[PDB]
Amino acid sequence: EVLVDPRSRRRYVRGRFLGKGGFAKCFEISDADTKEVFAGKIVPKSLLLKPHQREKMSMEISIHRSLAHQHVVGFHGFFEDNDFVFVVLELCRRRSLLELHKRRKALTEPEARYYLRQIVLGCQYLHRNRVIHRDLKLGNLFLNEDLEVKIGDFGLATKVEYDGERKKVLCGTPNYIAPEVLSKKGHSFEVDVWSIGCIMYTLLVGKPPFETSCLKETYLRIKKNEYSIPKHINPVAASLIQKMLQTDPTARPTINELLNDEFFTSGYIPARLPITCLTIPPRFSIA
């Protein structure tokens, strides 16, 4: 019920349940002194009996704590007792792109541009810091009160240690999983750009690129590149999706190139979005 840090002498009440991912149960929490409000991932040690498991949890924190950016969920601290691990993160009051997508389905182009821009800004930061998220999806992309985007859940993230490194395995299963991970051909940064492609598609279209009833049939399509963009999607968008969803990872654009695509440069990107837009499609009228 209460959660105490020895080293910082800070105590947090446990509030409402938000969700679960991996071994973590995540709750809204508040500091007993400042009444300031946080997001609290609570991982049971009962599930970290094995070294391999313990190291991932330990890597997650190492990576997350190394991060400070406008579009990355703010890291605030960690502590433990004998039974549980406790990680304290920024609370994103307006949930995630995933909830938005289930309420609104396909968004308008300029909403997509807005979110997409922020996502690519968060990811540019990661990549310049030699970090690959490896699991970017709508459920990961969080929204603060101003509907600003915060990348979260670093539990599949890896740090690149040397130039031209090719990671050989990925422990766990990403949602928008790159074809080169599936083919166990080795992988690096292009997996995040891959995911963004799927996310762009999903925001513009109202459903994921490669969906089927069998995950393993989905995996099949991802290998064969079997997906179509409907004809009502704009061809400047279509070009981008197509660019980002390429089997050959050397062909896909880097994160730093993406904001200089016609799709951002010759299209309208809102400075901000109103709350209304959580539920009602913004027409963007001139007055």
Ligand X SMILES: Cc1ncc(CCCN(C)C)cc1Nc1ncc2c(n1)-c1ccc(Cl)cc1NC(=S)C2
240 marked as binding residue:
no
DSSP per-residue string spanning 235-260: HHHHHHHHHHS-SSTTTSPPTTTGGG
Q: Which residue is nearest to ligand X (CB)?
A: 152
Interacting residues with Zn ion (CB under 5 A)? 171
Select from 282, 99, 107, 284 the least CA-distant residue to 201.
107
225 marked as binding residue:
no
106 marked as binding residue:
no
The answer to whether residues 272 and 210 touch, using CB atoms and an 8 Å cutoff, is no
Nearer to ligand X, 139 or 208 (CB): 139
Instruction: Give the nearest distance from C-beta 188 to ligand X in angstroms.
Output: 23
User: How many C-alpha atoms does 265 have within 13 Å on its Cβ side?
Assistant: 7
Nearer to ligand X, 105 or 224 (CB): 105
Select from 219, 208, 215 the least CA-distant residue to 178.
219
Alpha-carbon distance 268 to 113, whole Å? 8
21 marked as binding residue:
yes
Contact between 73 and ligand X by CB under 6 A: the answer reads yes
**Residue 42: count of CB within 10 angstroms of its CB:** 18
192 is catalytic: no
> Which of 31, 33, 135, 146 is flagged as catalytic?
135
Which of 91-99, 202-210, 254-262, 264-272 is the region at the interface with ligand X (rule: CB under 6 A)?
91-99
171 binds, among ligand X, Zn ion, none (CB under 5 to 8 A by kind): Zn ion
Which two structure tokens, joined as six digits, stand for 185?
Answer: 């051909």
18 marked as binding residue:
yes
Instruction: Give the nearest distance from C-beta 147 to ligand X in angstroms.
Output: 13
259 binds, among Zn ion, ligand X, none (CB under 5 to 8 A by kind): none
The answer to whether residues 85 and 48 touch, using CB atoms and an 8 Å cutoff, is yes
Nearer to Zn ion, 55 or 226 (CB): 55
152 binds, among Zn ion, ligand X, none (CB under 5 to 8 A by kind): ligand X
Contacts with 85 (C-beta within 8 Å, 6 or more apart), sequence order? 41, 42, 43, 44, 45, 48, 57, 78
- In the chain, the largest separation of any two C-alpha atoms, in whole Å, equals 61
Q: Which residues are catalytically annotated?
A: 135
- Residues found near ligand X in the complex (CB under 6 A): 18-21, 26, 39, 73, 89, 91-93, 95-96, 98-99, 139, 142, 152-153
Which residues are annotated binding-site positions? 18-26, 41, 90, 137-140, 153
Which residues are annotated binding-site positions for ATP? 18-26, 41, 90, 137-140, 153
